[PDB]
Symmetry: C4
Amino acid sequence: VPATRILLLVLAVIIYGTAGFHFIEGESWTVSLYWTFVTIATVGYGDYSPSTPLGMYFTVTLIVLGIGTFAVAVERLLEFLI
Amino acid sequence: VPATRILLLVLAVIIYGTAGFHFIEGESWTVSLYWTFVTIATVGYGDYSPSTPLGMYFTVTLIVLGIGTFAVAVERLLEFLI
Amino acid sequence: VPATRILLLVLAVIIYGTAGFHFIEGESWTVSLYWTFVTIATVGYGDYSPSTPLGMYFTVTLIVLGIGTFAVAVERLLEFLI
Amino acid sequence: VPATRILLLVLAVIIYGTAGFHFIEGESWTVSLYWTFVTIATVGYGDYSPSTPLGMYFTVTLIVLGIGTFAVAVERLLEFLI
Ligand SMILES: [K+]
Ligand SMILES: [K+]
Ligand SMILES: [K+]
Ligand SMILES: [K+]
Ligand SMILES: [K+]
């Protein structure tokens, strides 16, 4: 995949994760963006996590769609900076 | 490995993780499925974690069997969507 | 690397992590073995974590030596089971 | 990339992460170095995490710049020890 296409794909993931956590779990937009990165990078501090069943379902969907996408995006960013 | 075989393998992992956490640590089926994904993806929020020795042993077995399986499944899903 | 050599290397990592957490942070052998796997797999629940400076130093040493070793061992175990 | 260049790159990441967490979130230098490794290795215990908006932004920047760099450094260290 061209590197710019990978960029758009992870941006789409980040939008999905952020808006979903905001609306489902009710955290601010900023906290939700932070949580989305912490989740798809697999860091997982746990300072924020879903506490509702819908949130848990949604979080599984973000884990499945987002972790591989982020990993490829990181791998590509590595090339254009090193 | 054919992609559909990898799908079945991770589904088997998800069943093992979920039923085990449910019966050993006593959390609901839904929470247990959520915990299983959060564990084999290596996110690890810690909102749920085993608190019994059997649970800790079981969790090590899920980590060894499940993290590589999930990683391959993600890598394959990437191909059939990008 | 031959797969059996990788097995011995991760076992050595697991012994190092477990005895170190036990003696430095004072948790039981079982909890310490559990923490060692949760750490080198990068799950990181945080139900257990070092609270002393020596423990924090030691944990960095386990992260550097152990995460790559575990990742290779998982990758190999995948081959001999799939 | 030559292995010594990768070493310098991850050291630069570690300096960036440590000084940033120290000054933005106010934790000691030692705790901040520990947190930086726990973050870029994707362990993410959550015993320490940013609680300010600037800290959350900064942490996203460390996740994007640091996780791939650490992963390559681990992969290389593996070669020069096995
Ligand atoms: K983690
Ligand atoms: K974690
Ligand atoms: K990899
Ligand atoms: K992780
Ligand atoms: K955690």
